[PDB]
Amino acid sequence: AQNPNCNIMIFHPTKEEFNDFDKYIAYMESQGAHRAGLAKIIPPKEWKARETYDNISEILIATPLQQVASGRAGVFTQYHKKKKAMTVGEYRHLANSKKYQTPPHQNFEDLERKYWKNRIYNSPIYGADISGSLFDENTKQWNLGHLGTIQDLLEKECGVVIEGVNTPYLYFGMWKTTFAWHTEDMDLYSINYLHLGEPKTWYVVPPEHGQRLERLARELFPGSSRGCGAFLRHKVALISPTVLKENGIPFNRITQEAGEFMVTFPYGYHAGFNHGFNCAEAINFATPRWIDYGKMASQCSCGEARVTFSMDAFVRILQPERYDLWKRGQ
Ligand SMILES: [NH3+]NC(=O)c1cccc(-c2nn[nH]n2)c1
Ligand SMILES: [Cl-]
Ligand code: NA
Ligand code: NI
Ligand SMILES: [Zn+2]
């Protein structure tokens, strides 16, 4: 059995191995990468996403979000307060201001300690889920806007055409910008590229142990759990590595740097934070191995989670018994 301890694996594909995306995902899984929930892929030296990042300043962040915490340093929720629009250039200047800039620190571990000690006392601002892409159209390898669609995957595996599209999103982060514990919609894969800037630290729970995390979350956020049987779907709960370790929850951590890809695997819970101003791009995707995870994915039907149009078909076809109840929550 490959990677029995569910360690996060790091891959260094050659330029030849970088041609066929699906093939490489399958190769990583043949090595047990998925057991960890998250893998890092370092592109070959011959590859680049686009020529420069010199001309990105005019991109608009239509609704920046201020992430306001409640709770305690290691166990907190965050809610997203909407702010007035601003450009990426304006956001970059804000991230670098004395109020929001990354503090002096010795190494990634010192910064990690400062994050978990101090995050709740600040409210960082970020740009999230901005449809768009920064890959140049001439980048033919691992271009996140040119991947096979989930709708086509389902059609290929199960035989029926469905409506819906699948396009990338941009994220602009600053110090302490936080992504709460979650799996992807319908327990899809994700792929995540860090285009520019400071690092992003990730925490992940092996898929085989996701229920352990759920059980702990239920204990630590008891009101939220009563409100929804899949409340981690809401993407607002944080639990620190110290608290995870105290509670015996299996997990791993890794820092992604600019120029690196991260893949999350079906039912791999993840959370993390940004070290300073950065830009990432991400998209969900599927493979044949996802289908069984999609069939079995929990769903939030309390109303809070969101309205993702593309998800409808996925629930409708894979989860017919649940569909009407889920559709009401939409
Ligand atoms: N699955 N991918 C993610 O959860 C992900 C991808 C890119 C950026 C972020 C993110 N970075 N800061 N807040 N959220 C999350
Ligand atoms: Cl700090
Ligand atoms: Na470990
Ligand atoms: Ni995610
Ligand atoms: Zn819910």
Side-chain angles (χ1 to χ4, degrees):
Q2 290 310 295
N3 190 22
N5 286 354
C6 301
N7 297 316
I8 299 168
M9 298 178 73
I10 302 159
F11 294 87
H12 289 84
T14 66
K15 62 188 190 310
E16 297 86 6
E17 288 166 347
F18 220 47
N19 288 321
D20 182 334
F21 182 81
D22 290 334
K23 178 166 181 186
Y24 202 76
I25 302 300
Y27 169 69
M28 293 188 284
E29 294 186 334
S30 76
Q31 303 304 290
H34 57 295
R35 291 194 68 179
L38 178 69
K40 175 179 292 192
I41 309 93
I42 296 172
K45 65 187 188 288
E46 296 85 1
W47 180 88
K48 69 180 139 189
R50 67 176 304 107
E51 297 300 318
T52 85
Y53 294 87
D54 292 344
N55 308 298
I56 71 165
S57 291
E58 311 301 315
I59 291 172
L60 192 71
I61 302 173
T63 308
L65 300 175
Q66 180 168 38
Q67 303 187 290
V68 180
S70 299
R72 67 185 175 94
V75 183
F76 63 89
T77 57
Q78 58 187 4
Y79 86 86
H80 293 180
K81 176 174 181 210
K82 297 179 165 77
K83 303 301 283 196
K84 154 175 193 271
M86 74 177 84
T87 66
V88 165
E90 289 168 336
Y91 180 81
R92 180 173 62 223
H93 188 263
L94 184 66
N96 292 336
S97 70
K98 294 188 186 174
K99 182 176 186 56
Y100 292 111
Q101 181 61 289
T102 315
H105 59 284
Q106 301 193 359
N107 46 57
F108 294 160
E109 290 182 9
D110 184 25
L111 192 69
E112 179 183 43
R113 278 190 296 275
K114 288 174 166 34
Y115 174 84
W116 291 105
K117 187 178 167 274
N118 301 313
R119 158 69 184 95
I120 63 167
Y121 304 109
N122 301 83
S123 298
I125 298 166
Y126 85 129
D129 300 325
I130 294 160
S131 298
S133 186
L134 290 174
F135 283 91
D136 191 275
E137 64 186 339
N138 304 314
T139 297
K140 300 305 187 328
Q141 297 168 317
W142 289 52
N143 181 325
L144 300 188
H146 298 349
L147 302 180
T149 74
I150 299 159
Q151 294 81 13
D152 288 343
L153 184 279
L154 271 165
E155 171 188 333
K156 285 178 293 193
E157 298 300 296
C158 301
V160 87
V161 186
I162 54 165
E163 72 289 356
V165 296
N166 178 197
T167 54
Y169 301 90
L170 301 171
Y171 299 82
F172 294 94
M174 68 168 58
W175 168 232
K176 286 176 174 167
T177 296
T178 300
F179 48 111
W181 282 105
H182 67 289
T183 61
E184 306 303 299
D185 290 336
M186 289 297 277
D187 294 342
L188 284 158
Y189 297 70
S190 70
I191 179 155
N192 312 279
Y193 184 67
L194 192 54
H195 281 285
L196 176 72
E198 305 315 306
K200 180 181 313 282
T201 294
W202 300 68
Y203 301 94
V204 62
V205 174
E208 72 198 59
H209 301 305
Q211 295 84 357
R212 299 191 189 206
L213 181 72
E214 293 173 351
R215 177 171 70 255
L216 177 64
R218 293 191 303 269
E219 293 161 1
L220 292 181
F221 302 95
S224 301
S225 184
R226 280 186 289 275
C228 180
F231 77 101
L232 292 173
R233 289 294 169 199
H234 305 168
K235 306 190 327 168
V236 299
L238 279 300
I239 306 166
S240 73
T242 298
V243 172
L244 294 176
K245 279 207 172 323
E246 293 172 342
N247 288 278
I249 307 306
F251 73 96
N252 285 112
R253 74 189 81 190
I254 193 166
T255 301
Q256 177 188 24
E257 296 189 87
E260 304 179 338
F261 289 90
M262 308 297 294
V263 167
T264 80
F265 295 90
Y267 197 62
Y269 274 104
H270 53 284
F273 70 88
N274 296 295
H275 293 206
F277 172 69
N278 64 22
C279 173
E281 179 167 344
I283 197 174
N284 297 122
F285 71 93
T287 73
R289 198 180 64 85
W290 167 70
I291 292 293
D292 287 355
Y293 287 88
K295 291 172 176 169
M296 306 179 193
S298 61
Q299 307 300 164
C300 165
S301 302
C302 77
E304 273 306 292
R306 257 213 309 213
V307 305
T308 150
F309 238 75
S310 57
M311 247 190 88
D312 188 281
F314 312 149
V315 185
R316 199 171 71 243
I317 304 302
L318 298 179
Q319 307 184 135
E321 189 269 332
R322 294 183 171 171
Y323 179 69
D324 284 348
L325 171 68
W326 172 84
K327 195 48 186 287
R328 279 165 191 130
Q330 298 300 290

